[PDB]
């Protein structure tokens, strides 16, 4: 079981909106996690006796930038880890975590970026979701915009979260329009577009790279939540999503026996497989996380309480809940992250505090 072994606070006293362990850290190296808040990203190393060792930050030249999200990948040629960060300026920065140099950056979104996710099988495919109502898929090997997911049948308000399924064949997105939308990226069109993005070298051609405009989701529902949907994750063929209504809903498109890959864009039904209720999480932009194996789920609420659900049970509604509290942890927890071996859980807070829980 988890025990609180340490805490600290960052000097900017602004909300920490994101935290991510590097699950690509090398064998024998210490566990490392990144935090994002204010205009900075900071790396820490976990050591014995609860020590949280401060390494080095990247601080944006723009004092008005506010980083919201980060995501780890690695360089596909060298294996060295890379860190992507983004927030209110709508600029994606690719950071070398060793030196905290910004290697390159991407602009395109019309507004703030609310989440970044890397493809589960391709370290170069980066998904961003934005306040401008669109998702964008980037190839950070050839520095190309592969596709924009939008249109009037796309989201009609800010996109707040998205997630790739296990094989990276499809994306589920969600946001302020209360909707969850499915976008298949294993279509012939999208597989071809990804292949072409790898063949693009601007020094060897005259053409710009053409991005796909994907204006129709492969499924859409507004029947799960009744407010902003701010976090979504695949659990196999099922979906876990939450709003600001003190519940994570486990659901699937279609009827109970409907295969996810036979769902048509006109599908009108959903099936609710369970709901995990909790308390005092009425504000939006509050993210849950899962461990590497998807055996557990952790969510913090707006008064500093952690909920952890054990999903190693026969059916989703049988999940087993544990709660973790500390008398000094009273600020809203924006995001959690498990280490890859699941031995450490980190929570970060609106008062710039960081909380370490060891199993």
């Amino acid at each position: 079981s988890f025990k609180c072994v340490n805490s600290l606070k960052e000097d900017h006293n602004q909300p920490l909106f994101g935290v991510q362990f590097n699950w690509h850290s090398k064998e024998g190296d210490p566990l490392v996690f990144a935090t994002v808040g204010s205009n900075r990203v900071t790396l820490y190393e976990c050591h014995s006796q609860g020590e949280i060792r401060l390494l080095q930050s990247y601080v944006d030249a723009d004092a008005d930038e506010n980083f919201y999200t980060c995501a780890w990948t690695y360089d596909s040629n060298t294996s060295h880890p890379l860190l992507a960060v983004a927030g209110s300026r709508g600029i994606i920065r690719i950071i070398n975590p060793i030196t905290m140099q910004c290697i390159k950056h991407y602009v395109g979104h019309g507004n703030a970026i609310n989440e970044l996710k890397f493809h589960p099988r391709d370290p170069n495919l980066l998904l961003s979701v934005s306040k401008d109502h669109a998702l964008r898929l980037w190839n950070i090997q050839t520095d190309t915009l592969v596709a924009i997911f939008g249109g009037v049948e796309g989201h009609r308000d800010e996109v707040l979260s998205a997630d790739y399924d296990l094989l990276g064949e499809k994306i589920m997105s969600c946001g302020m329009d209360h909707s969850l939308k499915l976008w298949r990226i294993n279509s012939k069109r999208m597989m071809n577009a990804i292949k072409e993005s790898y063949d693009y070298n601007p020094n060897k051609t005259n053409r710009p790279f053409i991005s796909q405009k994907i204006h129709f989701p492969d499924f859409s529902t507004r029947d799960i939540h009744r407010n902003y949907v701010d976090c979504v994750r695949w659990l196999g063929d099922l979906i876990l999503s939450k709003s600001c209504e003190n519940a994570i809903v486990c659901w699937k498109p279609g009827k109970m026996e409907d295969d996810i890959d036979k769902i048509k864009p006109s599908e009108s039904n959903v099936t609710i497989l369970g709901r995990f209720d909790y308390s005092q999480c009425d504000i939006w932009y509050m993210r849950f996380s899962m461990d590497f194996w998807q055996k557990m789920l952790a969510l913090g609420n707006q008064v500093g309480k952690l909920y952890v659900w054990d999903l190693e049970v026969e059916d989703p509604h049988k999940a087993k809940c544990t709660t973790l509290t500390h008398h000094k942890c009273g600020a809203a927890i924006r995001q959690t992250s498990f280490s890859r071996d699941s031995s450490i859980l980190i929570a970060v807070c609106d008062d710039a505090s960081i909380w370490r829980w060891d199993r």
Binding site: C244, D282, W284, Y285, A331, A332, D350
Partner: peptide, 5 residues
């Protein structure tokens, strides 16, 4: 509806 507590 608020982003902050």
């Amino acid at each position: 509806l608020q982003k902050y507590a």
